[PDB]
nuclear polyadenylated rna-binding protein 3 (Saccharomyces cerevisiae), 78 residues
Amino acid sequence: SHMKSRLFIGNLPLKNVSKEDLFRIFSPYGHIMQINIKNAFGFIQFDNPQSVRDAIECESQEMNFGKKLILEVSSSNA
């Protein structure tokens, strides 16, 4: 009920990305606990693994922030 519930996001813009824009994109897949943006990647913590699978399935070919995002199930709990 916890494992595999975080979405890794790469290929974000170099310019600052709004957490509200990320929320708008990804909240339809499930409840979002955390949105964390780092220099070269970010993550979205959901509360269940199905949300992550669905986000990957549905958003991997979309242009979001002007990018085809790299989407994966994260192994991080940090």
Strands lie at 6-10, 32-37, 41-46, 63-64, 67-68, 70-73.
